[PDB]
């Protein structure tokens, strides 16, 4: 009944784990990074990293490890998902195609038992004789790794302990040995066992049971020369190996906690350690040589090494370059020096990697007043927390825009000898060519008396060797520039008007009638060299330097009008090489072949907007990949701009979209402009990196920003942002943030770092007089701050200090009552460490004047303020399982009217028309009606069978949507039945779905300009952005049929069936998908190969790729 759709906007960015080893070959050094559901592979070079492969799994990755069984060159990978899918995979590079096969499969789920804290742990034998797993408490799963057992059969072993923290297999033992740390009454211990897979029981470890300091959570297994283990905690680094015992207690640790490690020395002499707030460490293992026995160590030494972000995963790579893996902030790549610079730091960074992190809140804001808003989020954390301005497409920066009608061509020229940046531009209206002169910001007209002024030409610019070119239907001619006059004249010896020509930088190719004249532009004179009539008509040409040649192109390309085809053909003698046919019949209007990387591309832009591809190489020119794609309706020309050393081509279509190649694939990033026709570069001194461009009636020039689809501009604040609001008439933003602060011995607390929270241009402090009622000498406290940020320059114009320790929760800007003024309104809650439930809060309303910040009214509120929204002209709030409505009087006051206190922890809240959806923490969605006549709340419908919601919104006036903490979606619906006595307070779950992620905020709006109904965006903890919309009957039925015919055949990496994962799940309750369409699958239809699409349903293929296309652009 309820027909919906969910798709991906931006893949997650947080990093959950990273390891190194040997996938690509035995002599490569790989870096493996695991996202939420994404795996990516990096191989090491001398300057940094490089990507090779990207894969997605139908499950949440929880275990990732490398191992080397006997009798093969490289390692093997073991992965265990969140629904306990167990797999063995490995790396196959066969030719150029890369694929990863499943040399095993299985499911290790049980019937009775409880998933526990600390999640899943997966370890592997140093001799690779089994694989251990902790899944449920008190029960340890062992996988045998004999040559048989393709199905990953397992077996169970009972444990005398139920609470396991960490587990690793020891080094240099006779038979597979386990040593691990567990939790029980009377502290935590480390204690060891021996397995016997023949008789399936734990026998005895090599040494006895001892004790460890109360909060160790981190175990390192020492390699062969020393053996034993390293135990890391707070004020403890320890070594155990049989009987020998040693430890150190460095005084540095007190303030911060260690997180990750990676062994630096294969021998095991130095170690890397990652801190909870940035300082990377180094640990020292000092060894002695016995006179006759094996090596042994004396002691342990630490040293403060440098500064980094917060680390989640940490790997010493080699030669003093180290990856820092961050989940709460930007990850970076670091170089360690041999000599410490000033302040004594060895660290030098080379790259940084952006991470939206936990998207706490967001709003949709439209800056430049067009029909396209942009999203601003509250990203990052304690020391990296910033503001991100996520913009779809690149923003233009216009300088000289004039409404100039349609322009066929527009060229530059150089009026001086071959000096620096050009000084002239050449126009061309509908049927002639006009020459300008560009002496600065002004525009002027001056016709040179050496050119034509009444008839259109194809080429006007220069190639080389102090001369000018004249390419025309009526004549071909060359121009001398010192006289600025004419040197010679030529005409076509057929009196026939040319169709098209071609020349970029060294030679002209002109195509007349069925034949084609040729001459490369010689100094001061010209002679025919090459000539060959084409069997059928010629439509387009392309001549360009492709590499080690100063303009002279060995090859030539030819386009065709009626039945589109490319012909690889030599320039010098115009001999045929190959024939290759292309689809469609609609008319082309340009083709280009251009270099970006070692794999050359030729790109043809067709008349429907569809952009097609054939392959070209200078030596032979065999056909590379091929795929049917479409675009905007208006016909398209591609011609190239200059951006970088690997600069790329632009295009003209319905709406300008610049294609970009990142590693080897073409990215389809758009840009914010209405329509375009034609281009050329301008590199003036005052216009350093601009482009001259023609439109239907407009001229646009500007500057070029980034290349990939999403523009992020990081604005550092050193602030932990919470929520954000807009107030347009005030020409600014309102942002909440909150600061890390330690109490000093003097009672008062000063600071830890300089922050915008205290570095405000002007500041003010809350001055309440209604709170009146213990902090220690050294401890952590938290201070909260309102930030007004200039909407144009993104600088802190002002910052307001809330009271000490007031934990501010909510923000809104609206007009209330009959007041014409716009305000900033905050709901807060004085949180206490000792108690457990907020008893109070204030509702402060702010006037932000010309440059000052005023305060109006307080009206203390008897509890926390989880959510608010202006109802119609009233103020609707949610306070501690209550919902309330408020009125704005004329005398600048606020009064209560009607209450409702049946719920428990009514937290999320949305309104539509005259109905209220109150989301809940634990019970369910629930609906209210505001009844105007006598004026209070009256329940319409509810929902039983409780769920733990994490976001709630109103899709339409009749169905309702929520999201819950077990990573699932569901669209509720009203039941249309009679007997309205009790079952009309019952709402109907109609859709079921396993999203896989945690949803933090829902918002109406769309990140696109100005097939389905409704539009919604949400942001997740892992930094993903998702979108949901409703559907009608026909596309739903079609697409679910297609979903069956696609998930029946598609191969998961662990060959899990696609139905199982997308299926709804919960601790207590599980059913397959219904009511929903999966965008992940549907837009995954495009990576499928052409033949295998004819073994797709085969009532055709194009009719459905058009469907997936139209559903794609909604995000």
């Amino acid at each position: 009944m309820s027909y919906n759709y969910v798709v991906t906007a931006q893949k997650p960015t947080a990093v959950n784990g990273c390891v190194t080893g040997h996938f690509t070959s035995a002599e490569d050094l790989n870096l493996l990074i695991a996202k939420n559901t994404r795996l990516e592979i990096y191989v090491v070079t001398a300057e940094g990293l490089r990507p090779v492969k990207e894969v997605g799994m139908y499950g949440k990755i929880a275990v990732m490890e490398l191992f080397r069984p006997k009798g093969e060159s490289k390692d093997l990978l073991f992965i265990l998902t969140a629904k306990y899918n167990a797999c063995i995979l490995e790396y196959k590079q066969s030719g150029e195609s890369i694929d990863i096969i499943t040399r095993a499969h299985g499911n290790v789920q049980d019937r009775i038992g409880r998933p526990s804290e600390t999640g899943i742990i997966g370890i592997i034998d140093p001799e690779c004789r089994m694989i251990g797993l902790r899944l449920y408490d008190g029960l340890f799963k062992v996988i045998p790794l004999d040559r048989d057992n393709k199905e990953l059969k397992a077996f169970n072993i009972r444990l005398e302990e139920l609470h396991v923290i960490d587990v690793k297999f020891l080094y240099g033992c006779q038979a597979p040995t386990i040593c691990f740390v567990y939790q029980d009454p009377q502290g935590r211990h480390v204690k060891t066992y021996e397995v016997s897979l023949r008789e399936k029981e734990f026998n005895k470890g090599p040494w006895k049971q001892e004790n460890v300091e109360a909060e160790a959570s981190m175990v390192i297994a020492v390699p062969e020369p020393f053996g034993g283990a390293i135990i890391i905690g707070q004020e403890s680094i320890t070594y155990h190996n049989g009987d020998k015992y040693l430890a150190i207690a460095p005084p540095i640790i007190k303030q911060s906690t260690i997180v990750c490690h990676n062994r630096v020395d294969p021998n095991g002499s130095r170690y890397l350690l990652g801190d909870m707030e940035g300082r990377l460490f180094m640990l020292l293992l000092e060894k002695e040589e016995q006179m006759d026995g094996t090596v042994t160590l004396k002691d342990l030494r630490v040293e403060l090494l440098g500064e980094t972000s917060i680390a989640e995963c940490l790997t010493y790579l080699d030669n003093g370059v180290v990856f820092v893996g961050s989940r709460l902030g930007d990850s970076q790549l670091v170089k360690l020096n041999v000599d410490s610079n000033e302040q004594g730091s060895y660290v030098v960074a080379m790259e940084t990697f952006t991470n939206l992190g936990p998207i706490v809140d967001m709003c949709v804001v439209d800056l430049e007043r067009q029909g396209q808003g942009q999203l601003v989020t509250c990203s990052g954390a304690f020391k990296e927390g910033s503001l991100r301005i996520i913009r779809n497409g690149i923003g233009i920066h216009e300088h000289a825009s004039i409404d100039l009608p349609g322009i066929k061509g527009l060229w530059p020229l150089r009026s001086d000898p071959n000096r620096e940046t050009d000084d002239t531009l050449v126009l061309s209206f509908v049927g002639q060519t006009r020459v300008l002169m560009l002496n600065g910001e002004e525009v002027e007209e001056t016709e040179l008396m050496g050119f034509v002024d009444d008839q259109q030409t194809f080429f006007c610019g220069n190639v080389a060797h102090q001369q000018l070119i004249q390419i025309t239907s009526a004549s071909v001619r060359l121009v001398s520039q010192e006289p600025k006059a004419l040197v010679s004249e030529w005409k076509e010896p057929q009196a026939k008007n040319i169709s098209v020509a071609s020349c970029n930088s060294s030679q002209v190719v002109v195509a007349v009638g069925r034949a084609l004249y040729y001459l490369q532009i010689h100094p001061q004179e010209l002679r025919q060299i090459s000539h060959t009539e084409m069997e059928h008509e010629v439509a387009c040409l392309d001549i360009t330097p492709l590499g080690d040649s100063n303009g002279l192109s060995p090859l030539c390309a030819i386009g065709l009008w009626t039945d589109i085809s490319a012909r690889i053909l030599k320039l010098p003698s115009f001999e045929l090489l190959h024939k290759e046919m292309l689809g469609g019949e609609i008319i082309p209007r340009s083709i280009l072949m251009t270099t970006f990387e070692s794999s050359h591309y030729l790109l043809c832009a067709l008349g429907d907007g569809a952009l097609f591809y054939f392959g070209l190489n200078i030596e032979t020119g065999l056909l590379s990949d091929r795929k049917k794609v479409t675009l905007g309706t208006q016909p398209t020309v591609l011609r190239t701009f200059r951006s970088l050393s690997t600069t790329n081509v632009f295009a003209c279509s319905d709406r300008p979209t610049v294609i970009y190649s990142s590693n080897h694939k073409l990215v389809f990033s758009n840009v914010n402009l209405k329509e375009v026709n034609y281009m050329c570069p301008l590199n003036s001194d005052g216009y350093p990196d601009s482009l001259a461009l023609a439109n239907n009636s407009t001229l646009t020039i500007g500057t070029i920003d980034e290349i990939q689809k999403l523009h992020i501009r990081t604005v550092p604040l050193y602030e932990s942002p919470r929520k954000i609001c807009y107030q347009e008439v005030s020409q600014c933003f309102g942002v909440l943030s909150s600061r890390i602060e330690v109490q000093d011995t003097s009672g008062g607390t000063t600071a830890l770092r300089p922050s915008a929270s205290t570095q405000a241009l002007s500041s003010s402090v809350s001055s309440s007089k209604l709170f009146s009622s213990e902090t220690s000498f050294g401890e952590e406290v938290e201070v909260h701050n309102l930030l007004i940020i200039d909407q144009h320059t993104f600088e802190v114009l002002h910052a307001h200090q809330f009271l000490q320790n007031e934990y501010a929760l909510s923000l809104v800007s609206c007009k209330l009552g009959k007041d014409p003024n716009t305000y900033f309104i905050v709901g807060t809650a004085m949180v206490y460490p000792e108690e457990a439930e907020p008893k109070q809060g204030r509702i402060v309303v702010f006037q932000y004047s010309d440059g000052k910040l005023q305060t109006v009214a307080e009206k203390e509120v008897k509890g926390a303020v989880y959510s608010m929204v202006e109802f119609n002209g009233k103020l609707l709030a949610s306070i501690n399982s209550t919902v309330r409505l408020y009125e704005w009087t004329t005398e600048k006051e606020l009064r209560t009217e009607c209450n409702h206190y049946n719920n428990i922890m009514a937290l999320y809240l949305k309104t539509k028309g005259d109905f209220i959806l109150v989301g809940d923490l634990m019970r369910s969605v629930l609906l209210l009606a505001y009844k105007p006549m006598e004026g209070n709340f009256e329940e319409i419908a509810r929902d039983f069978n409780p769920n733990w919601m994490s976001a709630v919104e109103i899709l339409d006036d009749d169905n309702f949507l929520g999201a819950e903490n077990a990573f699932n979606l569901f669209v509720c619906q009203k039941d249309s039945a009679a007997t309205t006595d009790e079952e009309r307070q019952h709402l109907q779950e109609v859709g079921l779905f396993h999203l896989g992620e945690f949803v933090n905020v829902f918002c109406h709006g769309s990140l696109v300009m100005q097939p389905t109904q409704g539009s919604v965006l949400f942001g997740t903890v892992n930094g993903m952005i998702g979108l949901v919309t409703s559907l009608s009957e026909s596309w739903y039925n079609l697409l679910l049929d297609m979903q069956n015919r696609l998930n029946k055949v598609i191969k998961s990496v662990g060959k899990i069936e696609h139905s199982f994962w997308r299926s709804f799940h919960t601790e207590r309750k599980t059913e397959p998908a219904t009511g929903f369409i999966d965008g992940d699958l549907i837009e995954s239809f495009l990576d499928i190969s052409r033949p295998k699409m004819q073994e797709v349903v085969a009532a055709t293929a194009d009719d459905l790729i058009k469907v997936v296309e139209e559903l794609t652009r909604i995000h």
Partner: peptide, 26 residues
């Protein structure tokens, strides 16, 4: 065990207290 910042941790993705604990507490 204090609600506002345990929900804050859940928003940030830090290990929050288990839902069964809230079930017992509610």
């Amino acid at each position: 065990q204090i609600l506002p910042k345990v929900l804050h941790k859940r928003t940030l993705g830090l290990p929050a207290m288990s839902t069964t604990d809230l079930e017992a507490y509610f």
